[PDB]
Design a protein around this ligand. Structure first.
Ligand SMILES: [NH3+][C@H](CCc1ccccc1)C(=O)N1CCCC1
Ligand SMILES: [Ca+2]
Ligand code: NA
Ligand SMILES: [Zn+2]
Length: 369
């Protein structure tokens, strides 16, 4: 038990990176989050750090030299000279070239790796990097609005001092890049809950369980549209409890993508902020070194609410439902409250479906040593 020491990573410049006209990914949401939680007074209870800019050396602990050289070189003014490389590395459409792209990667990654170092040094219990969580980036390829996989880099940092690391992903999308990086090792178990079926990235079937020494160390919980707080709560705690019991990790990384909330512009789930944050509460109870990361999230008022509340949860600090005045106060109308209501959308995940998938995953977890 007990309240935990929390270190939080933020760079004020993050909100100025712009993916381009009409692109749904808005780094500004991280600044909105920051401003809201400062206005609730949460800075009084945690240490706030500005991350360093991760170097090419740091990024090539996972990514290829050629891919990182390309990301460090490509700019809107020289794009026409790089048309071949852009296609090779899947940059230029979903993952656009924007001003300051590499610096955005460096700040996103720096927070996650800095948090992992702090955890390794036993100087904090929890580290938070809401600018992180870019779970789709691959060794030599951008994907899913992600360029550099800060998560994989942070886990590699943790593996210097931790024999077994658990990765949990509650973003609505499958954490495919993290899963791929660790698919053939038992030193990282990856557990993703996600919408599955005619949905990005197309991976994360129940039957994808890892390979080689990593067989049984990837866990995928495929879901349908409309999952609600009750349905999610009923499987998350039992799955994570069984994973904790069987895998016995010494550190945890939790990707908290807010695109699994009700009303998300790109998502199709029906979780409230309380339902999402219940996941952070469950993981926190195991009293392991914990790195909490961001992720997707497209209805930006709800992203700010979600990550503010989850910061409060990390701190065991009760905050009022009445939102404090802040620099983005108009974004939180018409109610100006912290918590959200679910919609009346149909939950396609029947209780029987949820129990059945849970039972199939428990069968796989029985195969751990
Ligand atoms: N979870 C992913 C986005 C990952 C991400 C990218 C950049 C910064 C932070 C998090 C998502 O929502 N996507 C929508 C379709 C393509 C991927
Ligand atoms: Ca997920
Ligand atoms: Na693995
Ligand atoms: Zn997502």
């Amino acid at each position: 038990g007990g309240k935990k020491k929390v270190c939080y990573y933020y760079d004020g410049d993050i909100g100025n990176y712009y993916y381009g006209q009409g692109h749904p990914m808005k780094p500004h949401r991280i600044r909105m989050t920051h401003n809201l939680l400062l206005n609730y007074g949460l800075y009084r209870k945690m240490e706030i750090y500005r991350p360093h800019k991760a170097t090419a050396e740091e990024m090539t602990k996972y990514h290829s030299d050629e891919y990182i050289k390309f990301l460090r070189s490509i700019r809107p003014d020289n794009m026409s000279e790089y048309s071949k490389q852009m296609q090779r590395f899947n940059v230029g459409e979903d993952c656009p070239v924007f001003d300051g792209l590499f610096e955005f990667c460096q700040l996103s990654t720096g927070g996650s790796v800095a948090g992992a170092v702090k955890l390794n040094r036993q100087q904090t219990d929890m580290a938070v990097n809401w600018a992180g969580g870019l779970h789709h980036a691959k060794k030599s390829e951008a994907s899913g609005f992600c360029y550099v996989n800060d998560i994989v880099l942070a886990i590699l940092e943790l593996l210097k001092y931790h024999q077994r690391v658990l990765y949990i992903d509650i973003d609505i999308h499958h954490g495919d890049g993290v899963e791929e990086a660790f698919y053939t090792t038992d030193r990282v178990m990856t557990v993703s809950f996600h919408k599955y079926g005619e949905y990005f990235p197309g991976t994360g079937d129940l039957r994808d369980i890892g390979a080689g020494k990593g067989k049984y160390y990837a866990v995928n919980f495929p879901m349908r549209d409309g999952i609600d707080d009750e349905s999610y709560g009923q499987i998350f705690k039992p799955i994570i409890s069984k994973v904790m019991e069987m895998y016995q990790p010494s550190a945890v990384v939790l990707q908290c993508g807010a695109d699994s909330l009700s009303g998300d512009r790109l998502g199709c789930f029906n979780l409230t902020v309380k339902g999402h944050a219940k996941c952070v509460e469950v993981v926190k109870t195991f009293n392991l070194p914990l790195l909490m990361l961001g992720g997707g999230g497209y209805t930006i008022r709800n992203v700010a609410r979600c990550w503010t509340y989850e910061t409060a949860v990390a701190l065991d600090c009760e905050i009022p439902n009445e939102l404090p005045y802040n620099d983005y106060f108009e974004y939180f109308g018409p109610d100006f409250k912290l918590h959200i209501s679910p919609s009346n959308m149909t939950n396609q995940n029947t209780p029987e479906y949820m129990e059945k998938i849970k039972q199939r995953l428990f069968e796989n977890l029985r195969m751990l040593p």
